[PDB]
Design a protein around this ligand. Structure first.
Ligand SMILES: Nc1nc2c(ncn2[C@@H]2O[C@H](COP(=O)(O)OP(=O)(O)OP(=O)(O)OC[C@H]3O[C@@H](n4cnc5c(N)ncnc54)[C@H](O)[C@@H]3O)[C@@H](O)[C@H]2O)c(=O)[nH]1
Ligand SMILES: Nc1ccn([C@@H]2O[C@H](COP(=O)(O)CP(=O)(O)OP(=O)(O)O)[C@@H](O)[C@H]2O)c(=O)n1
Ligand SMILES: [Mg+2]
Ligand SMILES: [Mg+2]
Ligand SMILES: [Mg+2]
Lengths: 1047, 329
DNA sequence: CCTGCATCCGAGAGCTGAGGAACCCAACCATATGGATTATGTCAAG
DNA sequence: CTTGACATAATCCATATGGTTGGGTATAATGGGAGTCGTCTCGGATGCAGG
C-alpha cells in the first residue's frame, strides 16, 4: 500500500519483496543481557527514472521486528510481555434510531480506526437530508451532484419511498456542473482556503476516495456488502477514475435509510453491542497498524529526499531512512497500554493473560466514560466471551476473557462451534458460527437426552436469537457442543460450578491466577477434567517429541534416545525468577532406561503434579466456628501443615547496582570500603561482591562500592539489603563495558545483579483461597493436640467458619467437601465436569462405601461405639438428623451419608455437641504475602518541592493522611492531633527538626509553624500575578518568610 | 479565529507576488536609497545609523512607536538642505518604502522554505519568524547588479537563519553550535554505518568512521552530553495519579537526624570549650571559626589581643592538651 | 421592545495501595597554566 | 613569651591554548498538516424565535 513512492512531476521507488533474517541472540541471552528478541527485516527495492528507465536495485536493511516466542509472548528489553487483544466497534454501515426525535433514523459510516472520518447521514426536520463529517453539516445532494447523479437518476432510484425523495431535491445545486459542485463543496468544508480546482480535487479525493487515507477494512467491506446488498470494488466510499468521482456506498446507504424510514419490511436498526457488530484486533493487526504508520513516515522522508537529493546520483539506500519505522515499532512494544508486563505467577496466570480481551487502550473506551451499555453481558456473548470472569473494580465489564471453545476468525469476529442436527439426529459435523449467523437458527442445549445420537426427548430446550424456547426435536437445527464452551479456561476449573453464585465464581476464577507454586504441590482431589490440557498448552512441562527411550536423567538435563536413533538433550529450567518473583523450575519425572511413547511427560513444570495443574494442597477441613479465630473470613490452621512443608514456596529477589563515570572521578565496585570492621566485610569476595550461598539479613552489604565525595577522599555507596528482606544469595551476574551483546547506557562502566532466594512457610497473615471464592487470612496456627480430631485420632488441618456460606451462596465447596471425604477414605480422586458430573445420589453411594471402610476398620480391631458418640447421637436424634429406633452404627452411617462425623475437641476430649461436616478440600496460597506488605517509617526521604514524605514501601515512604482522615479527626474535635499531622510530621521543617531533637532529648515537642506547602502555594499564586498577603488583627502585613524574600 | 497558522497564511496571501520589472525596480530603489542615506551622512556630518533610524521612524509613522523629540529635531535639521540635496532624502524615503514592500512581497518564500524543518524542536511559527529574520538580512544584503533573481540569494539566508535558530533554541540545556554540528555528524555517521552493517554499530566502529582525532571514549562523552532531560510530570502507571517527580528525594536540606546530630555536636563543643579557660576558649573559637563562621589565622587573632602569632599558637596547643585531658576525663 | 427555548461550552464525576535531518571560516573572550609575590604556620632557639 | 630562620599555601598578574561565537555561501525556488468522531447531566450566557 505505501509503495510505490512516486515523486511529483522524476523518480519512482517501488517495493519488490521483503525477508526476515534470524535473531542475533537467543531468548535466554536476550533475557540475561536485557535485549529484545527480534529479527532483522530487509526490503529489496528498485529506483526507476521515469524517462531513462535506468533501474538501480538494492536490498536495504529496515531495522528489527520483535519475535513471538513459542508460548505466545515477547521479550522486550529483557522483560516478558504480552499484547492484549482489543475489542472495538466493527467498521461498516449502521442505522440507529434518532434519540431526540422518534420515527427518524441516523445512518453511520465507520472506517478502520485512524483511517478516515466517521460520516453521519440524517433526514433534517425540514426535509433535506444532511451529512455530517468532521463536525460540518452540509447537504448530501451536493456530494451526490459531485459523484455524477442526475435528477432523473435520483428520482427513479428513490421515487418509491415517498416524500423523502422530494425533500432531497434542490434545483440550485442541480443546475451546477460536478466541477462547480466540487468547488462549492470544498468551500463548505474548508472555509477561507483559496479554492483552486486541483486543490479541491486533492482534498475531496483524500477525504473519501484515497486508499492511502480512507480504509474500510476487510471487515467493513464485508459488513457493508452484506448489509446493503451491493458489491464493493475496493475499500473506499468512492473512486476517482477518468478524472472524475464515481459513487460506491452513498446511494445504497441513502436507499437503505429511506426504506427503513418508510417502514419497508426487511430493514432493521443495528445493535452496536451485538457481537456481530464488534470485532477483535489481535497482536498481529495492532503491530501491523503501527508498522503502517512507521512506513508512512518513511515514505514522507523518502519523498523529501527525492525532492532535495541530486537526481543523477541516487540509490534506494540513500533515499531510505529507517529511523521512523524502528521508532514506531519500539513505541508500540514499550509504551502501548496494550503491551503489558506478563503475569507469570503460575502457568495459568500467563495462559489467562494471553486470552484477555480489553475494551480500553489507544482508540478504545475510557474507564470513566463507559456507562452500563459496554459493561453488560450481551446475549451474543454466549459461547464467545465468558460471562463470569471479569475484574471486580472500576474495570468490570471492560476487560473480559475468550470462551474456551471460541475462535477469532480472519475478519476479527469471534466464532463458536455447533453440531449440525438433521431430522432430529445429532451428527458429528461441527460448524463455527458468528453471532449474526447464529441468529438464524434454533439451537438446542448440549444436555439434551440422546439415544444413540437421536434426540430422545419430546420437549427440547433451545435458544432462538438468545430467547429460551421449548421446541420439538424436528424444529432443532443445531446443538451446543459442550457446557465448557460457555465459560473461560479459569472458570472451567471450578467443580460444581452450577451450585455457585456468579459473583463468588468470579472471585474463584480470578483468585486461581494469584496461586503460588508450592514445593509439594498437589492436583485437586475433585477435578473438572481440564487440568492436563492447561498444563500441556502452557509449555511449562516437557514431553517426549517421539516414541523412544530415556538415556540420561539429571536435575538439569534429560537426554532421550528416539527410535530415529538420534540423541536429543533437553536442558531443565532450574530456580528461575518469574516477573512476579516466584521460582519456576522443572523437575524430572522419568528414570534411566524407561520407555516413553509420543507425548509422554518427561519433567513437571511449576505448579504441576504428574502433568496435572497443581495450584495448592488437599487438606482435611472441618466446617465449624472455633473460639472466634475464624471470625469474619479468618482461617485457623494446624501446625502439622508447617511440619510436613505444606504451603511452602520459593521466592527470588533481584538487586541491581551500577558503577558509572562521575565528574569527581569514576565509581568502582570493590571490597576496599572505609569505616567498616571486618565483621561487615565477611561475605564479600575479593571483587567486592557477596559470595554464592551466604545468608544476608537487612543491613548486610551485597555489592561494595565507593564514590568520590568531593565537598571541599572516598565514601560508602554500597548496595545493602532493604529492611524486611534477605535470604540466601543464589546468583550474581556482572555486565561490563565491551562485553558482546551488552548495551549499557552512556557513562555506566558496569552493572552487577544479585539474586537472593527465600523459602517461605505459611504464617499468620497469609492469604488462602479455594476455587469457589472463599478467601481468608490465616489468623491462628494451633499445635496438633489442640485441633479437633476424628475418633481414630486423626486431626483436621483447616477449620472454616460456616457463616461464610449462607450469604455468599457458594454451595459447590460443600459438595466438594463431601466428595473429598469419600475420596479420602476410599483413596481415590474424581473428575466432575461442570453442569455434567457428580450428583447427590452418586456421592451418597461413594460415602456409603467410604463408611464401610471407615467403620469396618474400627470394628475389626475390636472396638464398639464410644460413650461420647452415643451422647452425640442422642443430641442428633433430638436435632432430627437421624431416625429414632436404629442401632448406633446405623445412625452413625446415616450421619456419614450426610457428610457429617462425630468430632472430638482436642482441648477437653469431650465431643462437639453436634456432628460436624469434615472432608478434603483443595486450598491454594495466594501471592498476597504479609511479608511483602508490612512497612513502617519514623523519618526518611522528602520530596523536592512540597518537602513532604515520599510514598511507597520501596522509597521508605509514609502513609497518606488524606481528606477524609482529616474529616474524621475534625469530627472528633482532636485539634492538636490534626495540627501535629499537618505540620510536625509532614512539612514543617523547623518543627520536625525541633520535634525529633526534643524527643531524643527527653522533652515534649514544641509548637508547630507554617507548613512549607502553604509557602509554595503563596509563591505559585504570586507567579499568577496575584498578591496574597497574610495579615494580623490590625490588617498589617505578617511576613511568613522570616525576611528572606524582602529586598 | 483560532489556529494562528491559517491566519498568518491568509495575511501572507493577501499580498500579491512580484514580476521581474517590479522586483528589479524595488531592489534598485533599495540600493539607491541606501546610497542616498550615506550621501546625506557625508553632507550633514552625523552618524549614518541615527539618520537611518530617523528616516525609518518618519516613514513608519506615529502608528509604530531614539524618541519623537530627537527624531523631530534631526528631521528639522534635515530641512536646512539648500537644493539638489533634499533629493537624497526623497530617494532614501522611497528606498525604505521599497525595502518594506520587498519583504512583504517575498514573505511566502520563507514559508515555503520553513515548512521542511518541522519536528526538530521548534514549532512551525517559530521557524517562520526566524526565516523572516533571515529574509530581512537577505533583503539588506541583496545585489541586483549581478542580475540574479532575489529568491536565489534569499534562500541561503533563510536557511541559515532557520538552522542557527534550531541550534540555539531547540534544547532546554543549551549546547553550542559546533557541538550541535558534532552531534548531528555523529548521528548521521552512526545511521549510515548501521545501514551498512545491518545492526547498531559499537562505539569503536563509530570512532573509526569519524576520522582522526576520535576514540571510543570521546564518542561516549559526546553521546552522554547529547541526552535531553526528562519531565518531572511524566505519568507513571495507567491512572492519572502517579508522576515521575513523586519518586525523587531531596538531598539538599539536612534531615532531622542530621540536624539533631549537628545540634548535639555544637552543644558538645560548647561544653568542651567551657571546660577550658574562657580566654583560651575564645582564642580557639576565633581560630576554629566558632564566633563568626570564618576561620582566622594566628596573626589576626593575635592582633585582636595585641599579641604575637606564636603565643596564640602555643596557648592553642595548651588548650588542645586540655581537650585531651577533658576527653580522657 | 419584552419574553421563552434550544444551543454551546465549560467544569465535575470516592479513598487507600502499587507502579517507571549543512558546512566552513575567521576573530574573541574565558579559563588554564607559570612564575613570582604574600601572608601562614612550624622547628629551633634564646 | 618572644625572636628568628626556612617551607610551604594563597593570591596576582601575564599570557597561551581551546572552546565558543558571529558571518557567509548568488540557477531557481513563493499558502501546512494531523485528525476524530461510544458522557451525562447541569448550569449560565446567549443568539434566535415568537408575541
Ligand atoms: N480502599 C479500598 N480497599 C480495597 C479496594 N479493593 C479492595 N480493597 C480491600 O482489600 C480487600 C481484599 O482485596 P481483594 O482480595 O479483593 O483484592 P485483590 O488484590 O485480590 O484483587 P482482585 O479482587 O482480583 O481485583 C482488585 C482489582 O482492583 C485493584 N485493587 C486491589 N487493591 C486495591 C486497592 N487497595 N485500591 C484500589 N484498587 C485496588 C487491583 O489492581 C485489581 O485490578 C477487600 O476486601 C477490601 O477490604 C479498593 O479499591 N479500595
Ligand atoms: N472500589 C472499592 C472496592 C472495595 N472497597 C472497600 O472494600 C470493601 C470490601 O468489598 P467486597 O466486595 O470485597 C466485600 P463487603 O462489601 O465488605 O461484603 P460482605 O457484606 O459480604 O461482608 C468494601 O465494603 C469497601 O469498604 C472500596 O472502598 N472501594
Ligand atoms: Mg477479589
Ligand atoms: Mg465487611
Ligand atoms: Mg476485606
Amino acid at each position: 500500500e505505501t509503495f510505490p513512492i512516486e515523486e511529483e512531476d522524476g523518480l519512482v521507488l517501488d517495493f519488490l519483496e521483503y525477508r526476515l533474517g534470524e535473531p542475533p541472540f537467543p531468548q535466554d541471552e536476550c533475557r540475561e543481557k536485557d535485549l529484545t528478541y527480534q529479527a532483522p527485516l530487509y526490503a529489496r527495492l528498485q529506483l526507476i527514472h521515469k524517462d531513462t528507465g535506468l533501474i538501480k536495485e538494492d536490498e536495504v536493511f529496515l531495522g528489527h521486528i520483535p519475535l513471538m516466542t513459542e508460548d505466545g509472548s515477547f521479550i522486550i528489553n529483557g522483560a516478558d510481555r504480552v499484547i492484549v487483544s482489543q475489542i472495538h466497534r466493527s467498521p461498516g454501515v449502521y442505522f440507529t434510531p434518532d434519540p431526540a426525535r422518534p420515527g427518524r433514523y441516523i445512518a453511520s459510516i465507520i472506517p478502520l480506526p485512524k483511517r478516515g472520518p466517521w460520516i453521519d447521514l440524517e433526514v433534517e426536520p425540514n426535509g433535506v437530508v444532511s451529512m455530517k463529517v468532521n463536525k460540518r453539516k452540509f447537504p448530501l445532494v451536493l456530494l451526490l451532484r459531485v459523484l455524477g447523479y442526475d435528477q432523473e437518476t435520483l428520482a427513479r432510484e428513490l421515487g418509491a419511498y415517498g416524500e423523502l425523495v422530494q425533500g432531497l431535491m434542490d434545483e440550485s445545486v442541480f443546475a451546477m456542473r460536478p466541477e462547480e459542485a466540487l468547488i462549492r463543496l470544498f468551500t463548505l468544508l474548508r472555509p477561507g482556503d483559496p479554492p483552486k480546482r486541483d486543490k479541491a480535487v486533492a482534498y475531496v479525493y483524500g477525504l473519501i476516495a484515497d486508499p492511502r487515507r480512507y480504509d474500510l477494512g476487510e471487515a467493513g467491506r464485508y459488513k457493508a456488502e452484506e448489509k446493503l446488498g451491493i458489491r464493493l470494488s475496493g475499500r473506499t466510499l468512492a473512486r476517482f477514475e477518468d478524472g472524475e468521482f464515481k459513487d460506491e456506498v452513498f446511494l445504497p446507504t441513502l436507499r437503505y435509510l429511506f426504506a427503513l424510514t418508510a417502514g419497508v419490511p426487511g430493514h432493521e436498526v443495528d445493535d452496536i453491542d451485538h457481537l456481530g457488530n464488534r470485532r477483535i484486533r489481535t497482536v498481529g493487526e495492532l503491530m501491523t497498524d503501527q508498522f503502517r504508520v512507521g512506513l508512512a513516515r518513511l515514505a514522507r522522508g523518502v519523498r523529501e529526499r527525492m525532492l532535495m537529493g541530486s537526481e543523477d546520483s541516487l540509490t534506494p539506500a540513500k533515499l531510505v531512512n529507517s529511523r521512523p519505522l524502528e521508532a514506531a515499532i519500539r513505541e508500540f512494544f514499550s509504551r502501548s497500554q496494550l503491551s503489558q508486563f506478563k503475569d507469570e505467577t503460575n502457568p495459568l496466570s500467563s495462559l489467562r493473560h494471553k486470552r484477555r480481551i480489553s475494551a480500553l487502550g489507544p482508540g478504545g473506551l475510557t474507564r470513566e466514560r463507559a456507562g452500563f451499555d459496554v459493561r453488560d453481558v450481551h446475549r451474543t456473548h454466549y459461547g464467545r466471551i465468558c460471562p463470569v470472569e471479569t475484574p471486580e473494580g472500576a474495570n468490570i465489564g471492560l476487560i473480559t476473557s475468550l470462551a474456551a471453545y471460541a475462535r477469532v476468525d480472519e475478519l476479527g469476529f469471534i466464532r463458536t462451534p455447533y453440531r449440525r442436527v438433521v431430522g432430529g439426529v445429532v451428527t458429528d459435523e461441527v460448524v463455527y458460527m458468528t453471532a449474526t449467523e447464529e441468529d438464524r437458527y434454533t439451537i438446542a442445549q448440549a444436555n439434551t437426552p440422546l439415544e444413540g445420537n437421536r434426540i430422545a426427548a419430546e420437549r427440547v430446550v433451545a435458544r432462538r436469537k438468545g430467547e429460551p424456547v421449548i421446541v420439538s426435536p424436528e424444529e432443532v437445527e443445531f446443538m451446543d457442543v459442550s457446557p465448557k464452551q460457555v465459560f473461560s479456561v479459569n472458570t472451567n476449573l471450578i467443580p460444581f460450578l452450577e451450585h455457585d453464585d456468579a459473583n463468588r465464581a468470579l472471585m474463584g476464577s480470578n483468585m486461581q491466577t494469584q496461586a503460588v507454586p508450592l514445593i509439594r504441590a498437589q492436583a485437586p482431589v475433585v477435578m473438572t477434567g481440564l487440568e492436563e490440557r492447561v498444563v500441556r498448552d502452557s509449555l511449562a512441562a516437557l514431553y517426549a517429541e517421539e516414541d523412544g527411550e530415556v538415556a540420561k536423567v539429571d536435575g538439569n538435563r534429560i537426554v532421550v534416545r528416539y527410535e530415529d536413533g538420534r540423541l536429543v538433550e533437553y536442558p531443565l529450567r532450574r530456580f528461575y525468577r518469574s516477573n512476579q518473583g516466584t521460582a519456576l523450575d522443572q523437575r524430572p519425572r522419568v528414570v534411566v532406561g524407561q520407555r516413553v511413547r509420543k507425548g509422554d511427560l518427561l519433567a513437571d513444570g511449576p505448579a504441576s503434579e504428574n502433568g496435572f495443574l497443581a495450584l495448592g494442597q488437599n487438606v482435611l477441613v472441618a466446617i465449624m466456628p472455633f473460639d472466634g479465630y475464624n471470625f469474619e473470613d479468618a482461617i485457623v490452621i494446624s501446625e502439622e501443615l508447617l511440619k510436613r512443608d505444606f504451603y511452602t514456596s520459593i521466592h527470588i529477589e533481584r538487586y541491581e547496582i551500577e558503577a558509572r563515570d562521575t565528574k569527581l572521578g569514576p565509581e568502582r565496585i570493590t571490597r576496599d570500603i572505609p569505616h567498616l570492621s571486618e565483621a561487615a566485610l565477611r561475605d564479600l569476595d575479593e571483587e567486592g561482591v557477596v559470595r554464592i550461598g551466604a545468608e544476608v539479613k537487612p543491613g548486610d552489604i551485597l555489592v561494595g562500592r565507593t564514590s568520590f565525595k568531593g565537598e571541599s577522599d572516598v565514601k560508602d555507596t554500597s548496595l545493602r539489603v532493604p529492611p524486611g528482606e534477605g535470604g540466601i544469595v543464589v546468583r550474581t551476574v556482572r555486565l561490563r563495558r565491551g562485553d558482546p551483546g551488552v548495551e549499557l547506557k552512556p557513562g555506566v562502566r558496569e552493572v552487577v545483579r544479585v539474586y537472593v532466594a527465600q523459602k517461605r512457610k505459611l504464617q499468620v497473615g497469609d492469604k488462602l483461597a479455594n476455587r469457589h471464592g472463599n478467601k481468608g487470612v490465616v489468623a491462628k496456627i494451633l499445635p496438633v493436640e489442640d485441633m479437633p480430631h476424628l475418633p481414630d485420632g486423626t486431626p483436621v488441618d483447616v477449620i472454616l467458619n460456616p457463616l461464610g456460606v449462607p450469604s455468599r451462596m457458594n454451595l459447590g465447596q460443600i459438595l466438594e467437601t463431601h466428595l473429598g471425604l469419600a475420596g479420602y477414605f476410599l483413596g481415590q480422586r474424581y473428575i466432575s465436569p461442570i453442569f455434567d458430573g457428580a450428583k447427590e445420589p452418586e456421592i451418597k453411594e461413594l460415602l456409603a462405601q467410604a463408611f464401610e471402610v471407615y467403620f469396618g476398620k474400627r470394628k475389626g480391631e475390636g472396638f464398639g461405639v464410644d460413650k461420647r458418640e452415643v451422647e452425640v447421637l442422642r443430641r442428633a436424634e433430638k436435632l432430627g438428623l437421624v431416625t429414632p429406633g436404629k442401632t448406633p452404627e446405623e445412625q452413625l452411617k446415616e450421619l456419614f451419608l450426610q457428610g457429617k462425623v462425630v468430632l472430638y475437641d482436642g482441648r477437653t476430649g469431650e465431643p462437639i455437641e453436634g456432628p460436624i461436616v469434615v472432608g478434603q478440600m483443595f486450598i491454594m496460597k495466594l501471592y498476597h504475602m504479609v511479608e511483602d506488605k508490612m512497612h513502617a517509617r519514623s523519618t526518611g526521604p522528602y520530596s523536592l518541592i512540597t518537602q513532604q514524605p515520599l510514598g511507597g514501601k520501596a522509597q521508605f515512604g509514609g502513609q497518606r493522611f488524606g481528606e477524609m482522615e482529616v474529616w474524621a479527626l475534625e469530627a472528633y474535635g482532636a485539634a492538636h492531633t490534626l495540627q501535629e499531622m499537618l505540620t510536625l510530621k509532614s512539612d514543617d521543617i523547623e518543627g520536625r527538626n525541633a520535634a525529633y531533637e526534643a524527643i531524643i532529648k527527653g522533652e515534649d515537642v514544641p509548637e508547630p509553624s507554617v507548613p512549607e506547602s502553604f509557602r509554595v502555594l503563596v509563591k505559585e499564586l504570586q507567579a499568577l500575578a496575584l498578591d496574597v498577603q497574610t495579615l494580623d488583627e490590625k490588617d498589617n502585613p505578617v511576613d511568613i518568610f522570616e525576611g528572606l524574600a524582602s529586598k | 479565529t483560532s489556529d494562528p497558522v491559517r491566519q498568518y497564511l491568509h495575511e501572507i496571501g493577501q499580498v500579491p507576488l512580484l514580476t521581474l520589472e517590479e522586483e528589479v525596480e524595488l531592489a534598485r530603489k533599495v540600493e539607491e536609497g541606501m546610497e542616498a542615506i550615506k550621501k546625506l551622512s557625508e553632507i550633514t556630518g552625523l552618524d549614518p545609523d541615527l539618520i537611518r533610524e530617523v528616516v525609518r521612524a518618519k516613514i513608519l509613522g506615529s502608528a509604530r512607536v531614539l524618541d519623537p523629540k530627537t527624531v523631530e529635531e534631526i528631521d528639522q535639521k534635515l530641512k536646512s538642505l539648500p537644493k539638489e540635496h533634499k533629493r537624497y532624502l526623497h530617494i532614501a524615503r522611497e528606498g525604505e518604502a521599497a525595502r518594506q514592500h520587498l519583504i512583504e512581497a517575498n514573505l511566502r518564500l520563507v514559508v515555503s522554505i520553513a515548512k521542511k524543518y518541522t519536528g526538530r524542536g521548534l514549532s512551525f511559527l517559530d521557524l517562520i519568524q526566524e526565516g523572516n529574520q533571515g529574509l530581512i538580512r537577505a533583503v539588506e544584503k541583496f545585489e541586483y547588479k549581478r542580475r540574479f533573481k532575489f529568491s536565489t540569494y534569499a534562500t541561503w539566508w533563510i536557511r541559515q537563519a532557520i538552522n542557527r535558530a534550531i541550534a540555539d533554541q531547540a534544547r532546554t540545556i543549551r549546547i553550542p553550535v559546533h557541538m550541535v554540528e558534532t552531534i548531528n555528524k555523529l548521528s548521521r555517521t552512526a545511521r549510515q554505518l548501521q545501514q551498512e552493517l545491518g545492526r547498531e554499530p559499537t562505539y569503536e566502529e563509530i570512532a573509526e568512521a569519524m576520522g582522526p582525532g576520535w576514540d571510543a571514549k570521546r564518542v561516549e562523552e559526546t553521546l552522554k552530553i547529547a541526552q535531553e532531560p526528562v519531565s518531572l510530570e511524566t505519568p507513571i502507571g495507567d491512572e492519572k495519579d502517579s508522576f515521575y517527580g513523586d519518586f525523587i528525594p531531596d538531598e539538599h536540606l539536612p534531615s532531622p537526624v542530621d540536624a539533631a546530630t549537628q545540634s548535639l555536636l555544637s552543644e558538645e563543643l560548647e561544653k568542651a570549650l567551657s571546660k577550658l579557660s574562657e580566654r583560651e576558649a575564645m582564642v580557639l573559637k576565633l581560630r576554629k571559626g566558632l564566633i563568626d563562621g570564618r576561620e582566622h589565622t594566628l596573626e589576626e587573632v593575635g592582633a585582636f589581643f595585641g599579641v604575637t602569632r606564636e603565643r596564640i599558637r602555643q596557648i592553642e596547643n595548651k588548650a588542645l592538651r586540655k581537650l585531651k585531658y577533658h576527653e580522657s576525663r
